[PDB]
Each structure stands twice: as structure tokens, then as C-alpha cells.
Design an enzyme around this catalytic site. Structure first.
Site, PDB file in Angstrom:
ATOM      1  N   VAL A   1       0.802  -1.222   0.000  1.00  0.00           N
ATOM      2  CA  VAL A   1       0.000   0.000   0.000  1.00  0.00           C
ATOM      3  C   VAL A   1       0.841   1.281   0.000  1.00  0.00           C
ATOM      4  CG1 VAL A   1      -2.063  -1.090   0.994  1.00  0.00           C
ATOM      5  CG2 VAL A   1      -0.376  -0.049   2.506  1.00  0.00           C
TER       6      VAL A   1
ATOM      7  N   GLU B   1       7.978   0.074   5.270  1.00  0.00           N
ATOM      8  CA  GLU B   1       7.196  -0.400   4.137  1.00  0.00           C
ATOM      9  C   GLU B   1       5.849  -0.873   4.699  1.00  0.00           C
ATOM     10  OE1 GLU B   1       9.651  -2.919   1.576  1.00  0.00           O
ATOM     11  OE2 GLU B   1       9.255  -1.188   0.229  1.00  0.00           O
ATOM     12  N   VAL B   2       4.761  -0.549   4.014  1.00  0.00           N
ATOM     13  CA  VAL B   2       3.419  -0.822   4.532  1.00  0.00           C
ATOM     14  C   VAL B   2       2.668  -1.716   3.557  1.00  0.00           C
ATOM     15  CG1 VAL B   2       1.296   0.193   5.458  1.00  0.00           C
ATOM     16  CG2 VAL B   2       3.464   1.428   5.697  1.00  0.00           C
TER      17      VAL B   2
ATOM     18  N   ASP C   1       4.591  14.798  13.425  1.00  0.00           N
ATOM     19  CA  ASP C   1       4.641  14.590  11.951  1.00  0.00           C
ATOM     20  C   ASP C   1       3.217  14.650  11.403  1.00  0.00           C
ATOM     21  OD1 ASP C   1       5.930  14.227   9.515  1.00  0.00           O
ATOM     22  OD2 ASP C   1       5.957  12.087   9.680  1.00  0.00           O
TER      23      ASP C   1
END
Ligand SMILES: Brc1cc2nn[nH]c2cc1Br
Length: 332
Positions: free
Chosen positions: A39, A46-47, A150
Site C-alpha cells: 500500500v 514499508e506498509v 509529523d
């Protein structure tokens, strides 16, 4: 400088609450989760969309590239401390592969739409709704002694059909300890508050409110990123060309900050530009007097003068959403 709200939360918690370096990670079983598809790619994570092979529920799998174990423990501890909070991503498990020992975080899945696709389809009251929902998450984390550091569209997942918002990516988040000098290399350039850009290290939750302001200006004015500097110095210059340098000088004097000579030359001297200058035919339907007043109360140099998240929730801009949810809690 010390936060004017939620100042002392961390001394009202046990040491183990904030002392994340002392955390012992209880690892789950990596074989319970199967990657389905990618995704997104971040700078060091990393997703993936995953599935829990046991209960068949969808999940999100965040594979964290090596960064100090201190940082992994910080992110985990914060997610554990915020678990169950309003509009906070829910951490379900912590796993690592048997051989490489690379850790992965397992979250509850959210059917997000890319803000570049979603935001153009949002109307005035949709923006009011989602900003209110984001404020609930920030007030909550602040109330629990944590600053996100963030805030930006990329870290706000929205399932628009279910009007569900989740604040994600707690990897830069920190515990607020009054008096602490923090690293100013946090957030993402276009969302950095002036405190970061002038090396004011004893900042607080209010950083997140500047970042929210930037996001909000980008939405209502359809100008994203709103403050588009080409480096950290130029980021301050882009802010100063809107807010003006008179307010900057007042701020620097109040906090006893001496501006870097190169930076001072780059900033030069600029008049304040009124917020109405950003209104145009394409965005005018998203702008109201209430939206401008709210924005103006977020984007202030002086971090201590910005609205807090909880104060923001009271602003007239949010009248409708606030009244509607209050009705449902009465019915509860
Ligand atoms: Br959707 C979603 C996307 C994510 N990227 N990074 N963490 C995430 C958590 C969820 Br839930």
C-alpha cells in the site's frame, strides 16, 4: 518555554509509562499474518495490507527498516499508551521474521483514500468534520503526554464512507517532558513550525497545531503544500512572506532567540499578507469568516499563542459537528 496545557502528565504516570528504552517487547507470531499487497513506501518503513490467517480479519503490516532499537521501542510504547484513544491507529501485534529479526507492527485496517484523490471531493462541512476528528486525536495524545511531531495529510487515514479518521505513523512521536531540549529535525519540511526552523529546542504539543494549520490552509485554499520551501531555511522564508517579519522579530525577542546570520539575510523583511489574498474562484466555497479566523489562530509564530487542540474544538467553525456528536453522547 513549557507547555501551557498537559504540562505535567508524564510525572503523573509511572516511570515505565515514558521510559521506553526499558521496554521489553513481547513478540507475537509472524506466521499469523500474511502479506496481501503493498500500500505504500516510506523513508524507513514499508506498509502492506495483510490478513490475519486465524480470524481472517484484514490488517496493515508495517515493516520497519533498521533504525535504533530505542526508536522502535519508542514507537511501540507510544502506540501501546495511546491504544483505544479516539481516532488513534490501533496496534494489534508486534512480530519479527525468524531469520532477519526485522520487526513488523500489525495494525487494524483502514480503507483509506489518497488525500490527492479524496480532498478534491470534500465539501466545506466535510472539511469541518474531518479536521474536528483530527483534533480529537491530537487532544487525546497531548492529554497523554505525547506529541506526534509529523502531522500532515499523508499521516491521516480516512474511510470516507464510514467517516472514520485515524492518525497514523507514530515513529517520530515523543513524550513531552517540560524543560526537555528536543531534536528540531522532526516533522516533514512543509509542516515544520517556526520553533523548529529557528532552533527553539524546548518546544511542546503546540508544534502539532502549527502542522495542522498548514494542512488546513492547504485544504481550504487548495494550495498544497501551503508553505513550500526548498530547504529548512527557505521554509522560514516562505512563512515570513505570509505572516510577515514584524511578528517573527517579536517572537525571536520574546524567546531570546538569535537568528542564524545566513538565515536572517534570507528572511529579509516582509509585510503580513492577509488570509483573504489566498481566496479565489475555485476555493471560495470552502472559505468562510469562521475558517479564516480558525486558521489565523493556528498559524502564529508564538507557539504559546496558538489554539490548543481542545480549544480548537470549541471554535465556531466546528459548531455543527460539535452539536451533532453531543446529541449522540446524550442518547448514549
Ligand atoms: Br490504512 C494504514 C496505513 C498505514 N501506513 N502506515 N501505517 C498505517 C496504518 C494504517 Br491502519
Amino acid at each position: 518555554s513549557k507547555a501551557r496545557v498537559y504540562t505535567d502528565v508524564n510525572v503523573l504516570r509511572p516511570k515505565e509509562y515514558w521510559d521506553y528504552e526499558a521496554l521489553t517487547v513481547q513478540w507475537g507470531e509472524q506466521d499469523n499474518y500474511e502479506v496481501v499487497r503493498k500500500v505504500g513506501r516510506g523513508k524507513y518503513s514499508e506498509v502492506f495490507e495483510g490478513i490475519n490467517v486465524n480470524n481472517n480479519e484484514k490488517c496493515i503490516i508495517k515493516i520497519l527498516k533498521p533504525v535504533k532499537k530505542k526508536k522502535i521501542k519508542r514507537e511501540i510504547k507510544i502506540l501501546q499508551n495511546l491504544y483505544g484513544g479516539p481516532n488513534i491507529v490501533k496496534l494489534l501485534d508486534i512480530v519479527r521474521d525468524q531469520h532477519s529479526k526485522t520487526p513488523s507492527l500489525i495494525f487494524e485496517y483502514v480503507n483509506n483514500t489518497d488525500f490527492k484523490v479524496l480532498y478534491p471531493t470534500l465539501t466545506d462541512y466535510d472539511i469541518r468534520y474531518y479536521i474536528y476528528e483530527l483534533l480529537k486525536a491530537l487532544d487525546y495524545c497531548h492529554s497523554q503526554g505525547i506529541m506526534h511531531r509529523d502531522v500532515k495529510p499523508h499521516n491521516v487515514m480516512i474511510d470516507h464512507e464510514l467517516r472514520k479518521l485515524r492518525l497514523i505513523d507514530w515513529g517520530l512521536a515523543e513524550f513531552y517532558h517540560p524543560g526537555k531540549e528536543y531534536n528540531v529535525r522532526v516533522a516533514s519540511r512543509y509542516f515544520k513550525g517556526p520553533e523548529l526552523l529557528v532552533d527553539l529546542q524546548d518546544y511542546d504539543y503546540s508544534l502539532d497545531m502549527w502542522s495542522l494549520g498548514c494542512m488546513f490552509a492547504g485544504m481550504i485554499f487548495r494550495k498544497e503544500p501551503f508553505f513550500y520551501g526548498h530547504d529548512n531555511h527557505d521554509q522560514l522564508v516562505k512563512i515570513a512572506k505570509v505572516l510577515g517579519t514584524d511578528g517573527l522579530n517579536v517572537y525571536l525577542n520574546k524567546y531570546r532567540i538569535e537568528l542564524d546570520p545566513q538565515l536572517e539575510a534570507l528572511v529579509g523583511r516582509h509585510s503580513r499578507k492577509p488570509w483573504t489574498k489566498f481566496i479565489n474562484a475555485d476555493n471560495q466555497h470552502l472559505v468562510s469568516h469562521e475558517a479564516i479566523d480558525f486558521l489565523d489562530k493556528l498559524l502564529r509564530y508564538d507557539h504559546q499563542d496558538r489554539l490548543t487542540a481542545r480549544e480548537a474544538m470549541t471554535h465556531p467553525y466546528f459548531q455543527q459537528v460539535r452539536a451533532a456528536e453531543n446529541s449522540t453522547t446524550r442518547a448514549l
